[PDB]
From a paper:
We describe the isolation and characterization of phages Moo19 and B2, including whole-genome sequencing and analysis, cryo–electron microscopy (cryo-EM) structure determination, mass spectrometry, host range studies, and enzymatic assays of the tail proteins. Moo19 and B2 are similar to bacteriophage N4—these are all T = 9 podophages, which encapsidate their own polymerases—a hallmark of this phage family.
Because we could not resolve the highly flexible side tailspikes in either Moo19 or B2 virions, we purified these components to examine them separately. We used a similar approach as described by Subramanian et al. and purified gp82 alone. Using cryo-EM, we solved the structure of the isolated tailspikes to 2.4- and 2.3-Å resolution, respectively. The tailspikes most closely resemble that of the tailspike in phage G7C and differ wildly from the tailspikes in DEV, which more closely resemble a myophage fiber. Each structure is a homotrimer, with individual ribbons colored cyan, green, and magenta. Therefore, we tested the purified Moo19 tailspike gp82 and the complex tailspike from B2, gp49/49, for esterase activity using a colorimetric assay. Both tailspikes exhibited a rapid, dose-dependent color change, indicating esterase activity.
Numbering used by the authors:
A (entry chain A), B (entry chain A), C (entry chain A): 462 to 1086
Write the structure that this text describes.
């Protein structure tokens, strides 16, 4: 019966379309849409599981580099998981499965489909892997052995069989993630497998497979620190690669809508950003609205006391370096550099596998310095640290993992500012030298803006407030960041006063002793005939008081729903004591007082408070290391 | 007959493919390609209509937040459009339909498919919405009620039915735009609907649906200013969300090729950029080539006199803030901050719904200041303003909407420079304090560049021109920006002169009185034994004269087709009077004259004209507020 | 027989699906997946061929602008390649086919499918183009004649037939690349074809076609320099467009995973980046790991002596300008600006077709200056040049093309830093004026970082090293960049010394004569009562010595696999002679010595070495022009 024939396997081949081709050929050529749709559906599901403390069953492919090949170092463990070669003490799938749940709360289950020396053709034809593993996401890395001619693999065969593997795992219900092959000389020798896998990356993008640039992971690392032989990593290299893959997942890198961090990006807890993926690893971050938050979003990132809380911010850094700024408060253990989440210590050179500037002349060896106490100058913007290297970065903000935190830690905002790598510092004065920029905090009294057609009356410059430049802020854990007991913690600045008459005064604004936040100005350069005509400059470090712009209950009850606050109610001097000072959320101001000897001259004053700040720093950050 | 059976509904199920599955199952799994292709075809059509003064029929989905739910504030209007709950006086679909035609000229027709408390399953099964509305684009927002368990909605049911809605509206010929759900505490409480709709965003990207991050819209706003209750917006919040959606459309955000503004992006009228989408709302922008344009592209953005002209620049800002620089001239009414296109004034706290820095200590309450008169220092780069917050931004450059503009306004270029939020200012001296950077305008006479092997002869430093740093430029509407009548409008700078002999002179370059653009230098620090040996420093603010690089008609007639101009013909002093001065298109130069007392010493001079400029400012911008 | 009928052309139409539509209609609507998959598969293949010295058969479409229409200038050649109109002496397909193999080694074969005045409908119905050309990639540009109503072309007909052309060329095995139409007034007149082709771009993105923004190419150029008539280019405009298309290809712009350069991006040879595509044009770049590399990646980009080596870095610049920094060494001929790879010189105004800032007041006419000798201050970061304009940029690092290079040239890293256009310089002091930023190199002895709770002992400030700011570095070819023989090559800086006691000293740090790299400080401003109490400041320019962090062979042999090096072994003075000095890879340090007259006061010293640097410069770059 033709019916049975139509219902048979070859039924689609007996029906031809208007172009002369059979229906079966049309279906076979156009099935990439089904694979693409299934792939991104499963990828969206996997992203949801990553960001919602879910569970991921992960199948890990392909060859020796996925298998954790290590036959050179003494940090090896016997061959497991269907491999034949001695494995490093920690490969990338296992570091991924130990890292992703730790940072995001998403449980990871490993299905190791990795054999050393295997090709894409070998993986597609491997007897043990012919069954559906029923996992959620599959990471595929096959280029190194393919380009070496292993098992007669050619570029066409490699590409065909990697496409076949992608389609097979998509049909198996697995989200296919394609990895640019990792390992070996940071691109030394112009390896063919990079080109092969680039072609395969584009063919994978045909199916909507996200590409994890694993070659990018080791670009800014020390080769000796991450490699066991000329091609394969040691334990630390594999661990860093797995951590970077997990960072890609918690960044939202599985999604097509993901955008890398290219400019200054400020995110907080509970808000969804396509640039920085935030993961609450244990679900105990209190993302409630409180007026006590130091940001206008009022979204307190409460890392509550007594609860082991882990706050994770993952993103792709599209620059050679970035500066992490945060409105943090409390004892927050911060890890953001690879090689400090995991280091077994088996090899002494693992610690030198951190992301470092490749330019020998632009940076010394990177001694990573992270802050754990961000409780000083409470309410102020804190310098969390720096991220070196282009790629996927994770900022781990966690409290005591045993739940022994006595006070609430707050992550009110995390700012990732891509910075040029030579203009970045590990901490404030935490490296040999900081290439800073002379930043001018300028104020005009009276300002010419908005006047128009009319000359404002000249004013006497007797007192003014200026936001303290970054050099004026100290670095230290907790209250040690305040220069109150150690007035050397702040860099003396310059206050340059200009007027329309050509009268110029330059003061050296340095802190006056170790009792309170008081600054005293020394006259450096002035245009006056006598130095006795120069006013005495005294300043104090203070924060702006809180005024209520719109009080809740003004147009109904209910009906500016919340309180719109500003810190423009006046400047109050701070003594550096958090128990008696106001919150520094209103800003760190240097409130200058000019004690003129005679009557205060009236004029159109331009005040420039000079300091050195990091490149592009929006707000002066207090250092906490 | 098997034929009738094949032609029947179940005909595809009776034919099986080579894998054992029926042809019908193959078609059902692989139909995502058709939906994706139709979706982006309609999205491209919708983008064309947005950017070509077209017409869009917009169907608005889904729940209470799309419906404009407001049952708390007194700014409510009775339930319309098939909803049951009291609506805010302006929801986001209606603000979108009032904003998109106003800014782009694209007529918007509303089909309100929004009911308060509705889920994706309820929308797919809603009796009134089972018919094809025959609209062009559909915006879908369903996560809040789904995650609350409304009508038994689960995550799987939610995802299934949102995918069903997307496919249904794609088949109906509607461009499907997916919105990250908006509303409530800026991410407070770690809402489940954010995660659900993130998963749904990825599944929508399966179908090529652009994702409008509506959660991102309220991240940098005051919660009390935009919310009516804990989850739903008031009139201003909905208005800002609709304006942001329209900004996404006029940015080109409907297209996969759209790229966010990540670095300094300069665009003008009539040119197509994948970063900044420009919309001519009324078709009356004269985008002709004239040598009178202040830019080398010669594309004059003539907002012609007597014509109501609206120039719109929309884009996604991938930074926490940006600075708008423009080569504008004339009376251009500028609106670029949300909350100033629309504000009914019913609630006094609506004005505090502007994009503000969440850091209390990095910014006071944002008092938005926009310039309407950019006619001063004509030809110079103008500081248009700042954009705060990551997301979609619109820059509206419109003249008198009644056609009563007497002179032609010119938009020769608009530069959007992503800047760190703390380094941004609303206007020049328009906020409490500007965190500026000390910018050094350095010139070497003779320069060592390009010499090689040979020592150039030492030259006498008697006169030189330097581009005026930003601090040297004033702010004011029209001619009020020129410090000619009010010499306090400019900040005095420093001219530091170095030579190879170790001779150093530091002048205070301040403006000499209120008659003309003349600057006079006061000697601050010098290395000479006697201050009488220091030359007298006099400067004037002037522009470079026009020289013809290649005159049209030189190699044929026809045949450098146009005139290649440069402004390097010499420096001419300007008096600040636009009726007698040259155009400032040649740059704002401080032309210094050194009157040495004895013969002018010869040497290898390094001249550093110090000033304070905004972070990353390419060209010194004149302020116009 | 129904069987024959099913196997007939209309067989699919006789089988209907469950929705009532026939199987044929389902196949016709959902075939976009097959076209998309084939398109990106061929695009990945084409990208592989571009980056692996492959071969591309390129079919060039569409109208007069693809055909190289030029009927106005005297730089025309008779009509070739099936066109009817006089062609410019170099159109964009031929410049592309001469440029892509030159820069990437990928052989290009031209199939000219371009006729002047042709539309998309005309191209689809052209008799000569009905056959499959069996080429690899097709570039399509059809909007100008379509919007003019040529051959009755309407927007719907245009869109339909361009989609038909895209599908036809995808079925023909050709990678379809869609070009935003180029030509005419930089967007003058608000041309309709820009909008039409924007719609067509989105419909092309339906099929995964990469969009080459050719309208973006001429945005920052002089119109007179690139145009022959009001719409069509001259030879130079077409050449620049073809070079930009080739730059798009070597950037990896054919791939969906490509990301533009938005922030500082550092890449080297042999590494794969999704931001900067690196092409080894002749396969002779030695990308081996050597400790002699100036970067921590140790990937030497050896342009070996005696071999014609071409190193190409292509990328999309998502800013108005960028600065090219490189750790280069040797005689590397650098071309990075369009109009300098190709210029036939037939028209004198072709040289003014370079990417220039459109703001007349922010830049003079761009006199491009590129460095060929980067052998000075060996090991230091070099300022390669600047890239102006948003779009696709190529950095060509090639040695003597005849193989007469005597020494090995090294490309250890190329850094592309997007910079604001007004803050960019062509070379160090290579333009009229550099708008620099006052950068403060700050060091604290003792630093307050990491101490906590305890006051460190005060130290005497007798000697310290500081990384030299950019103003301290000279510019010149090879050893001419060293200020050793011509001490005017460096800009004198300021060393500001602060302490906790309010003692401030400001020195003028200028070079002490022309014998060696010795700097001497002149006291400018001090807070001391007597200038005799100020210490004598002497400095030398030196590099840090090499210390071994982890020596290879420490934990096994094999087993920190390589040597982890740092340059923190001490500071050694350099004389500027490359034959006797150390490599400058350890950094360019100004090592200051303070000779106090009495005993050296002890205190908490803040040292600020002030200089002027370019905006966002990570490491001080030596200029090489």
């Amino acid at each position: 019966t033709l019916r049975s024939q139509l219902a048979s396997t070859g039924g689609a081949a007996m029906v031809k379309a208007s172009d002369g081709r059979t229906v079966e050929q049309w279906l076979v050529q156009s099935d990439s849409a089904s694979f693409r749709a299934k792939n991104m559906a499963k990828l969206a599901w996997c992203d949801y599981q990553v960001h919602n403390r879910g569970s991921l069953k992960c199948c890990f492919l392909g060859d020796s580099m996925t298998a954790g090949f290590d036959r050179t170092s003494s940090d090896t463990i016997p061959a497991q998981d269907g491999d034949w070669a001695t494995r490093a003490s920690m490969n990338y799938p296992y570091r991924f499965a130990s890292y992703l749940p730790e940072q995001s709360g998403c449980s990871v289950y490993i299905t190791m489909r990795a054999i050393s020396g295997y090709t894409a053709k070998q993986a597609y034809e491997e007897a043990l892997w012919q069954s559906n593993p029923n996992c959620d996401i599959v990471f595929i890395m096959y280029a190194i052995n393919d380009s070496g001619g292993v098992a007669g693999a050619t570029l066409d065969l490699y590409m065909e069989y990697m496409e076949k593997l992608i389609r097979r795992y998509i049909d198996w219900g697995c989200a296919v993630v394609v990895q640019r092959p990792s390992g070996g000389g940071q691109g030394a020798g112009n390896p063919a497998w990079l080109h092969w896998a680039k072609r395969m990356q584009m063919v994978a993008r045909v199916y909507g497979c996200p590409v994890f640039d694993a070659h990018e992971v080791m670009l800014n690392r020390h080769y000796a620190a991450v490699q066991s032989d000329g091609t394969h990593y040691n334990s630390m290299g594999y661990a860093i690669h797995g951590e970077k893959l997990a960072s890609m997942l918690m960044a939202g890198g599985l999604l097509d809508t993901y955008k890398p961090v290219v400019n200054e990006t400020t995110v907080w807890t509970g808000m969804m950003s396509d640039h920085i993926g935030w993961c609450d690893a244990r679900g105990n971050i209190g993302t409630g609205r409180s007026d006590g938050a130091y940001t206008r979003d009022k979204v307190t990132g409460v890392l509550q006391a007594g609860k082991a809380t882990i706050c994770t911010f993952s993103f792709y850094l599209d620059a050679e370096a970035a500066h992490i700024y945060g409105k943090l408060d409390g004892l927050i253990n911060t890890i953001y550099t690879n090689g400090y989440w995991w280091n077994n210590g088996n090899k002494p050179y693992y610690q030198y596998a951190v992301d470092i500037d490749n330019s020998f002349g632009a940076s010394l060896q990177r001694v990573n310095k992270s802050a754990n106490n961000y409780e000083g100058m409470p309410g102020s913007r804190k310098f969390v640290g720096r991220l070196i290297g282009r790629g996927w970065h994770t900022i781990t903000l966690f409290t005591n993992l045993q739940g022994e935190a006595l006070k609430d830690a707050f992550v009110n905002s995390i700012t990732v500012q891509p910075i040029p790598i030579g203009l970045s510092t590990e901490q404030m004065w935490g490296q040999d030298e900081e290439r800073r920029y002379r930043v001018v905090h300028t104020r005009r009294m009276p300002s010419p803006s908005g006047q128009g057609g009319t000359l404002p009356v000249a004013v006497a410059l007797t007192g003014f407030q200026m936001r303290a430049p970054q050099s004026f802020l100290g670095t230290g854990p907790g209250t040690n960041a305040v220069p109150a007991p150690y007035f050397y913690n702040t860099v003396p600045g310059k206050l340059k006063v200009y007027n329309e008459k050509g009268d110029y005064i330059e003061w050296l604004v340095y802190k006056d002793g170790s009792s309170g936040l008081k600054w005293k100005g020394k006259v450096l350069t002035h245009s006056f005939a006598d130095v006795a005509s120069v006013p005495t400059l005294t300043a104090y470090m203070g924060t702006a008081k809180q005024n209520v712009i719109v009080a809740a209950g003004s147009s109904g009850a209910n009906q500016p729903l919340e309180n719109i606050y500003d810190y423009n109610a006046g400047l109050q001097e701070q003594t550096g004591n958090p128990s008696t000072d106001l919150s520094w959320k209103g800003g760190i101001y240097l409130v200058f007082t000019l004690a003129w000897p005679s009557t205060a001259p009236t004029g159109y004053w331009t005040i420039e408070l000079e300091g050195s700040d990091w490149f592009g720093n929006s707000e002066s950050a207090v250092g906490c290391f």
